[PDB]
């Protein structure tokens, strides 16, 4: 189960709600190969794939938990890829908004115990935990987050 499989699967429900252009997955794939988004958290790799806001109609996040790690190239330069198990796909129109979501995502990936639960919880439980967190961030109020925006892959 490859990088393209992951991106296509996380883009699918955004495409279905028309949140994004219908070729959004291919645009994220091409942007990931130019500007990689693999990040090293403490015990686990994270990726935050996205593309330009011109391709998004309305703001949303799509979350993926990988049963086994998948290599993503590093956000930061590194000879070795980042083995990722947690993926936040972003569909954000504006620069100002995306910088706020990334700050927020940093806070959750440094939450070691929340990340610990991300690896074990159900789709439903993951939904409720992220939804609560998002709703306590007034700057995140424009971001749409639905139960079908969470899934496991593999």
């Amino acid at each position, epitope marked *: 189960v490859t990088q393209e499989d992951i991106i296509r699967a996380l883009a699918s429900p955004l495409i279905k709600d028309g949140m994004v252009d219908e070729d959004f997955a291919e645009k994220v794939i091409e942007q990931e190969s130019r500007y990689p988004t693999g*990040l090293q958290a403490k015990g686990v790799g994270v990726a935050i794939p996205h593309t*330009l*806001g*011109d391709y998004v109609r309305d703001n949303a996040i799509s979350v993926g938990i990988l049963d086994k790690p998948v290599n993503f190239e590093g*956000w*930061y330069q590194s000879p070795d890829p980042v083995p990722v198990r947690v993926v936040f796909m972003l569909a954000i*129109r*504006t*620069w*100002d908004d995306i*910088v*706020n979501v*990334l*700050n927020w995502i*940093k806070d959750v990936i440094l939450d070691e115990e929340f990340m610990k639960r991300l690896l074990t919880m159900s789709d439903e439980e993951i939904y409720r935990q992220i939804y609560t967190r998002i709703s306590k961030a007034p700057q995140l109020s424009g971001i749409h987050f639905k139960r079908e925006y969470v899934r496991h892959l593999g």
Partner: antibody
Amino acid sequence: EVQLVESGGGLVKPGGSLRLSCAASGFTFSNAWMSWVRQAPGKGLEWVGRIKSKTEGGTTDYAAPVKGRFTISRDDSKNTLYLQMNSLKTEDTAVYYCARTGKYYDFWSGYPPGEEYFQDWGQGTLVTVSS
Amino acid sequence: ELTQDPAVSVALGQTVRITCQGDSLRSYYASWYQQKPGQAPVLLIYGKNNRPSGVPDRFSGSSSGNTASLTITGAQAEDEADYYCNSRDSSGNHLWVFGGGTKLTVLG
């Protein structure tokens, strides 16, 4: 090659109005944030204002001594940035630069919405406000 | 809100630190510009320590507390210029505030 060509500067009486234009080429103007920075003769750089790309929202920010007198706008179909200067004052005397403005945000340390920087400058147009 | 010494000297071929100081540097990075008389400013450093292509690796940026620094190793005569830092004030009269500028003279 990036090219930014300011024009429209000249002598104008206090209280008068002047419009500056800057013609851009060599980069995708409609994706670009664009700023005006000015320099009074012999003095330091002073940011005047900035207009975001349309996808970013097209919003403007202005320096306080200029707010309510100057307006920035853009014509993406003509790759041109404008600066409308009304109610001009002698302290507005300066070379006005148009600057392509990049944006930066560091994931692990940055503070939203990050930083703006002036990556390409035109050669400037001189605006003299005097009676 | 961004303070910078007006003038600094460096012997030819030595290292100079041009530092800028202000409250907003605690939270945001500085960008740095070189300006020689009669010319446009040129961007030298942005973000943490990124150089535009065509700026020599003798130039670097760093930051510590409420200060930010442009370091030029092995100064050359062509580095003589006014150097300006810029950062985010976000509450002041200039959203993007410039330091007053430091004129670098190369001795020797």
